[PDB]
Symmetry: D2
Subunit: 255 residues, 4 copies
């Protein structure tokens, strides 16, 4: 069956995506910086009858990404979809932004996506066909969010890469799209809430409260809500879609 | 089974959407101004082993839309999705636009969508649950297309309606989204090409050639390509998406 | 020597635009269907040393718009800029939208803009040069606003017209742009607030307070803020800008 | 008189902006990594009757940007506007992108803007008032351009920073906007065309001609066209505008 590699699949949205893709019929490579959670997710999948393999990789490292993609391609017998999902999101008061903070966020969120794109392109060529590249964006990648200058800008960058890649890779039978979540219940958001709440000298949940006011559907997102959109982007039903970054955010930003 | 009503389902994109929804498991109401084609499509669906009913309706007439929706709800045993697909697309040289031309296009493309939204809202309420409203937009509803002032503006209006409706109806558990095709092989585009070519003093095909140049995927769209996107919008996989007008245009416009 | 015609110039934003354009050096035609206010504004301008003429016109009527533009062109001795500013904005709960309401709003907001574009195109042609067409849009023309389905969709339509016109008329040396205000202190907003507040059973000001929450700059808009943006759109400094609908809304929507 | 600092003002768009701001009445700090051109431009301004000072700075370095702003603030007697204009734009075939290429482009284009924002914020606070931050974006910052993955994404990031900054800094009476040029006749574009043409094995001018096909106005941009837009963004007429990245690209992208 078809093969997909999902980065940051050890937990949160990445894990949800991996599980959904397995349900969709994909054999999946669980790629993550965290060896323990990657193996835990791969095990959960295999225990339920699916086909998964854990792959340790730091997406900020170009050679590691290529190695991860090739390992998955050889082991799973193919390569049809890559989901560049791994990412970090520290809240960043503008006056306190440092070169170190920018490097950390961009090396993972932006370079990681570029490396994933390149490795997938070569993998598709070696398999002798086209493919689907799916990147993790955010509604903050469409509209700069408050207190998230570095993160928001990194996601805008991902959307830019998504669009240029869609145009440049089209002749190779490759499409490039992205998914844009809103406020999702994962350790990532919990941390943003903590930083923003603490910085405002307010109780935990304050950040969630402020951002949740802009969610039209009136509830935070489940990782599965995002995975459901990614399922479409990994399916042939999205074959005629490219360069798009879909908002699966409960209606925070409208396009 | 879940129930959906598709306007303009007698042919083209509308018919393709209806057939795809049937494959997805929906009982479908084939709504069209053309009674003969609606009945033919419904018959085809029923003879094939699916469930459908044909309803004659001019979407520009509010009472006829409510009647069509209610007939579908009673006959099919429920109402879960409405696809306001019917539309017209005459090319309109700016200096030649008349109020008659504006009325013709807007009465179907804009008013028809408003009536569909209202009728669906009442059907959902009578059923005691939420629902999905899906509107036919166009890439021309995101970026004004040359020689298509009236058509483009009508689709921008449809997207505006889609967004306000998404915000106003969210409390009722109703989502409102749209699909934006590119250049689809149906009699609608055939006519635009003929009009644009003649006005330009160029042989037939000038329109297709000019617009086709912006399609990143380098191929024209099949009605089924659009139906594949609508399938997602009709599925529970789109539950957390609202107020979006997805581009399933082969990459003509990037969002 | 430059000439501009501003529709809906009898009060609010239109009047502010007219006065600013006069300060910028334009001879201005005060177009409005309100004879009293149009003549009062023209009088105010002429008494201060400026050059203006009042012109009676219901922008929903194509012939009247052409006649108004031609009267301005002949009386003021030229025609360089048209500002299609006149508009109406009733709040419209979705369930109660009627064909009459849609017609009232669209005949003024949408058709009025089309007639203005056409009339200006002919005027520029008769003057032997190009020109600037400026349309009144709204942040609600970029993102559908709650309780404003008909109004929002009409402004989305205006933006669509702005874009197609920009592309279609470029060869004639004509640019077409729009301005998008936020919450401006004029009788129009006061009425929206009254309608929304009444519908909700809230004291006057409820609507203003709710919509104001999204204004980044934390203050309501003055008609002069909008006039300052239009000044740019009417000046040669905007010569290389076309097809754009600028947000001069205090930061409600971001592009 | 008001004070403005323009990075990359030694040539191209930056020089044009500086000269226009001088005409508008500003005292300007010519900041550039090229000491020769910076002093040459400052010299031309002072000899012609204006007030300017050359400041050497590599915008990729945070400390240097702060030092440049402070030198400008002390020497020119104030600080009211900053134009983070400096930038680089290499064409980058996706398969050939290296971490080195990304760092070079992002350290200048993205970090440079962050440092400028921070330095400006502190300068404004020290001057005891608000201010205007203006960043150089590009139409490629709204839509990913072919063969320009790294450059396009860096400009998307700039827009992201522009938006978050506008929201975060609003309380300080600071607005943050950007300008988006199209194809401008400067050494930067000349180099992009050379790279793209050589890569395609086609004569010089190939890239220029291909990209120019998307310019609605049908003519290449002059640095002064961009400076004209920045003039508006530096003037009080843009006081009620924030978080916007205006397209002064001849109509390549429409918002
Ligand atoms: N949580 C949200 O609300 C939200 C909203 C929008 C977008 N997103 C995006 O969705 C993606 C998933 O976020 P999430 O909530 O699941 O985050 P998370 O923090 O819960 O999970 C991130 C995963 O990434 C892995 N990872 C981190 N750095 C890595 C690196 N250098 N190399 C490899 N793996 C690495 C982690 O081990 C972890 O399992 C991210 O790109 C995020 O920006 C999240
Ligand atoms: N064809 C394209 O390239 C393209 C691209 C973008 C968007 N769209 C949109 O997709 C939708 C379907 O277009 P299509 O190509 O299938 O068109 P089509 O002309 O092939 O089919 C339109 C259907 O609408 C029905 N219809 C027309 N007026 C009606 C009315 N007043 N009431 C009820 N039914 C009515 C017709 O009988 C017909 O079956 C439209 O909304 C169109 O704007 C089409
Ligand atoms: N007020 C706001 O908050 C706001 C925000 C965004 C956009 N706008 C837009 O700005 C424009 C000006 O709005 P405003 O607040 O000044 O409105 P307003 O109601 O205060 O003034 C409108 C003017 O239009 C004239 N007018 C109305 N219908 C007309 C017709 N058919 N023919 C000719 N003249 C006609 C009126 O006589 C009046 O002088 C409108 O297009 C409006 O949609 C206003
Ligand atoms: N030229 C175009 O067609 C075009 C289109 C869109 C956007 N832009 C943007 O406009 C801005 C100006 O571009 P341009 O055409 O004038 O470029 P240019 O290459 O002609 O001029 C750039 C200036 O930046 C200075 N500079 C470069 N790196 C620097 C650094 N690290 N620190 C300080 N100064 C540095 C250079 O010395 C030079 O004077 C850039 O941000 C560019 O991305 C240009
Ligand atoms: O940077 C280039 C990458 O792809 C190349 O094809 C090599 O096979 C791989 O080892 C390398 O990491
Ligand atoms: O009044 C608008 C519509 O809704 C009403 O409730 C009626 O049920 C329907 O016949 C009518 O067309
Ligand atoms: O018909 C549209 C308008 O333009 C025509 O060219 C005529 O000049 C004018 O009388 C008419 O009202
Ligand atoms: O940390 C960035 C800047 O912070 C302060 O402004 C310091 O005065 C300056 O020296 C430094 O470069
Ligand atoms: Mg803070
Ligand atoms: Mg190539």
């Amino acid at each position: 069956k078809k093969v997909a590699l999902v980065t940051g699949a050890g937990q949160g949205i990445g894990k949800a995506i991996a599980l959904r893709l397995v349900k969709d019929g994909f054999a999946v490579a669980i790629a993550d910086y965290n060896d323990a959670t990657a193996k835990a997710v791969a095990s959960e999948i295999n225990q339920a009858g699916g086909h998964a393999v854990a792959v340790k990789v730091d997406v900020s490292d170009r050679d590691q990404v290529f190695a991860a993609v090739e390992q998955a391609r050889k082991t799973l017998g193919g390569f049809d979809v890559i989901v560049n999902n791994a990412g970090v999101a520290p809240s960043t008061p503008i006056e306190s932004i440092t070169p170190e903070i920018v490097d950390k966020v961009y090396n993972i969120n932006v370079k990681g996506v570029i490396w994933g794109i390149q490795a997938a392109v070569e993998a598709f060529k070696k398999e002798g066909h086209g493919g689907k590249i799916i990147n993790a964006c955010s509604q903050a990648g469409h509209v700069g969010n408050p207190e998230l200058a570095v993160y928001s800008s990194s996601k805008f960058a991902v959307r830019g890469l998504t669009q240029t890649a869609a145009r440049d890779l089209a002749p190779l039978g490759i499409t490039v799209n992205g998914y844009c979540p809103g406020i999702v219940k994962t350790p990532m958001w919990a941390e943003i809430d903590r930083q923003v709440s603490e910085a405002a000298g307010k109780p935990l949940g304050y950040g969630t409260a402020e951002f949740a006011k802009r969610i039209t559907l009136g509830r935070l997102s489940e990782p599965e809500d995002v995975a459901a959109c990614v399922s479409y982007l990994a399916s042939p039903d999205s074959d005629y879609m490219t360069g798009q970054s879909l908002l699966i955010d409960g209606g925070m930003v409208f396009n």
